[PDB]
Amino acid sequence: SQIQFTRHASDVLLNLNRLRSRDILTDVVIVVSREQFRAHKTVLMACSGLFYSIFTDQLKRNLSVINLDPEINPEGFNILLDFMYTSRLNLREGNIMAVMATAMYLQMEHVVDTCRKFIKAS
Amino acid sequence: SQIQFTRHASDVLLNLNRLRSRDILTDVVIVVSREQFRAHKTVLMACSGLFYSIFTDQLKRNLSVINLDPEINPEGFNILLDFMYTSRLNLREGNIMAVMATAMYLQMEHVVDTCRKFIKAS
Ligand SMILES: COc1ccc(CNc2nc3c(ccn3CC(=O)Nc3ccncc3Cl)c(=O)[nH]2)c(OC)c1
Numbered sequence: 001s002q003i004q005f006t007r008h009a010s011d012v013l014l015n016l017n018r019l020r021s022r023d024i025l026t027d028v029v030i031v032v033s034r035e036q037f038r039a040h041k042t043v044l045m046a047c048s049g050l051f052y053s054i055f056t057d058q059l060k061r062n063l064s065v066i067n068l069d070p071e072i073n074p075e076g077f078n079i080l081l082d083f084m085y086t087s088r089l090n091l092r093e094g095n096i097m098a099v100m101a102t103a104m105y106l107q108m109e110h111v112v113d114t115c116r117k118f119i120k121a122s
Numbered sequence: 123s124q125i126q127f128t129r130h131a132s133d134v135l136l137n138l139n140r141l142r143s144r145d146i147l148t149d150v151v152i153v154v155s156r157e158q159f160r161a162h163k164t165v166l167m168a169c170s171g172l173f174y175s176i177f178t179d180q181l182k183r184n185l186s187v188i189n190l191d192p193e194i195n196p197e198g199f200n201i202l203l204d205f206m207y208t209s210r211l212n213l214r215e216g217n218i219m220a221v222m223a224t225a226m227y228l229q230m231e232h233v234v235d236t237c238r239k240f241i242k243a244s
């Protein structure tokens with residue numbers, strides 16, 4: 001019976017992305033080969049099975065640096081990080097395989113399924 | 123030209139609320155008279171002009187406790203905190219004034235405007 005604010009969640013996410021852009025309250029650096037990306041652990045956990053599994057463990061909860069698998073493409077990771085914070089996925093025929101493999105590694109099942117649909121439709 | 127995931131933002135918010143429910147990565151306690159509420163500063167900043175103005179200031183960025191104005195009703199605050207994390211506002215004729223006044227204090231203009239519409243429609 002509560003009143004629904006249909007833009008609230010999108011507004012929240014946009015504002016979280018603004019905070020990331022200003023490095024406000026970011027609490028982890030994700031290192032991917034020669035590149036690094038700062039983020040909020042909460043958003044990573046909300047969007048990725050890998051990050052959820054890492055930070056839910058009290059043993060790893062306070063890590064400030066995560067080194068991703070050396071074989072992960074920083075491009076693929078960047079695309080997915082921007083998706084996490086925007087709901088918009090930049091899939092193209094020139095990056096689909098990198099994005100899909102990265103999404104498998106990050107355990108983002110719905111994104112992987114969408115990548116498969118992209119392949120089917122191309 | 124990016125692919126839009128129309129449920130992603132809502133899913134993120136739901137997951138953030140799940141993290142709050144488990145006290146995972148919460149980083150502030152909001153004290154409101156005799157009650158206390160834990161939350162994520164990022165979500166508070168995303169949803170409230172008061173919290174945004176507080177935590178954007180490097181002087182207050184690292185506060186772990188915020189004591190709200192003693193005149194603020196903990197009920198009104200609780201209702202609004204749950205709105206922040208759910209997009210659903212529990213307005214009723216028995217709580218409208220408390221919620222509205224609290225939303226004014228928290229600088230949640232759209233919620234205040236909605237409270238005014240509620241009054242107009244009642
Ligand atoms: C409810 O059963 C779960 C929960 C979690 C996992 C991990 N696998 C996974 N996780 C994903 C996605 C997409 C985002 N997430 C993160 C997420 O759901 N986070 C979250 C969940 C519950 N409460 C708070 C939070 Cl932050 C994904 O495709 N697979 C699971 O794997 C089988 C099952």
Ligand SMILES: COc1ccc(CNc2nc3c(ccn3CC(=O)Nc3ccncc3Cl)c(=O)[nH]2)c(OC)c1
Pocket residue numbers: 015016018019167168169170171172174175229230231232
């Ligand atoms: C863009 O101009 C602004 C930004 C902020 C304020 C503070 N007044 C206010 N803030 C509100 C609501 C509802 C949620 N918020 C928080 C918010 O917008 N947070 C945010 C903004 C930009 N980047 C990152 C973040 Cl976290 C509200 O009704 N009034 C402003 O007041 C005039 C103007």
